[PDB]
Design a protein around this ligand. Structure first.
Ligand SMILES: Nc1nc2c(ncn2[C@@H]2O[C@H](COP(=O)(O)OP(=O)(O)O)[C@@H](O)[C@H]2O)c(=O)[nH]1
Lengths: 330, 12
């Protein structure tokens, strides 16, 4: 009889990293959670992907409906009058794919609408109704996603937009560190829950949608999205809870920002900006706008990264650097 | 009552 050894068996306890994802809606937080799942975890199994079929269809239909309604609000006519009929059917059949089944009729409606010239004229002005950034992804792949045998690919799942009700968490192991990553939205909660959420936080990743710089304001909004995010990041940087915390800034959606900066002047967001409307200088200006909100720059540093949260390779690289920083400060 | 995390942080 050989007495059994210790349960640990010579293994040390893993160091735990409490990481908080913060940022305004649509900044890329949940996309980063899903990227963590893809990179440092199992990925997504077919039983997991089949679950997102209904979500893919719902996001597609909601996006095309948002564009169609925007057309009515913006006084944009259809390129071909026939499309009106299609539009009507889209509202009749909007709930047809709740069973995960997109009928051929609905697919034809969406295809004929997405083809129209007026619908594309409205899509190009998407900034006037804050269209979500996954619309074109699904709509341009309509032929593929419409098939009956269709199962969402991993990139299809990254692009889904899901409503968050409770505690969105993911866990993984990276560089012998146990990461507890919590996605924190804008929901209202009890103060004790916030105290528990902000206690012992090792790192914060604050996500900022650069491409939100030119979006119109919704009614009763006191300021544009970029300035809302600047307000949030100010409160984050200069708070007592996070004096110990590593503050990381993900200037996300750089791929969309690069295409936008050509057509849309940064002055829409920052009227004082006198620089050029190029990717490099506008990006530097936004970076400095957020960084200068740090009112204790000597004692505390802000680690800034430009990211495309939907690009798994870029996210992997950036998170490797982020983890190096976390280790350095521990 | 219930409050967003931003308003919670700024309460101080
Ligand atoms: N082209 C592009 N789209 C992105 C990027 N990051 C997020 N998106 C999309 O923007 C939408 C909102 O992103 P999400 O992670 O859900 O923001 P959240 O509300 O903070 O969770 C989603 O459709 C994402 O797929 C990016 O870096 N580049």
């Amino acid at each position: 009889l050989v007495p059994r050894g210790s349960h640990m068996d010579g293994e040390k306890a893993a160091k735990e990293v409490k990481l908080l994802l913060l940022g305004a809606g649509e900044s890329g937080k949940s996309t980063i959670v899903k990227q963590m799942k893809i990179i440092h975890e199992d990925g997504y199994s077919e039983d997991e992907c089949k679950q997102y079929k209904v979500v893919v269809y719902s996001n597609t239909i909601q996006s095309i409906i948002a564009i169609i309604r925007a057309m009515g609000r913006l006084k944009i006519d259809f390129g071909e009058a026939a499309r009106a009929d299609d539009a009507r059917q889209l509202f009749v059949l909007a709930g047809s794919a709740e069973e995960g089944v997109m009928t051929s009729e609905l697919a034809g409606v969406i295809k004929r609408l997405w083809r129209d010239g007026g619908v594309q004229a409205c899509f190009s002005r998407s900034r006037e109704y804050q269209l979500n950034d996954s619309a074109s992804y699904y709509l341009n792949d309509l032929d593929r996603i419409s098939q009956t045998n269709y199962i969402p690919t991993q990139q299809d799942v990254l692009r889904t937009r899901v409503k968050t009700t409770g505690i969105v968490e993911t866990h993984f192991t990276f560089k012998e560190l146990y990461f507890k990553m919590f996605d924190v939205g804008g929901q209202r909660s009890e103060r004790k829950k916030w105290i528990h959420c902000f206690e012992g936080v090792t790192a914060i990743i604050f996500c900022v949608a650069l491409s939100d710089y030119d979006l119109v304001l919704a009614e009763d909004e006191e300021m544009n999205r970029m300035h809302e995010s600047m307000k949030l990041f100010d409160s984050i940087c200069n708070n007592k809870w996070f004096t110990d915390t590593s503050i990381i800034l993900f200037l996300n959606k750089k791929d969309l920002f690069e295409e936008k900066i050509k057509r849309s002047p940064l002055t829409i967001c920052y009227p004082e900006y006198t620089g050029s409307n190029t990717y490099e200088e506008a990006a530097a200006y936004i970076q400095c706008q957020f960084e200068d909100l740090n009112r204790r720059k000597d004692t505390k540093e802000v680690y800034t990264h430009f990211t495309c949260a939907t690009d798994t390779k870029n996210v992997q690289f950036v998170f490797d650097a982020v983890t190096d920083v976390i280790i350095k400060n521990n | 009552s219930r409050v967003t995390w931003y308003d919670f942080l700024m309460e101080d």
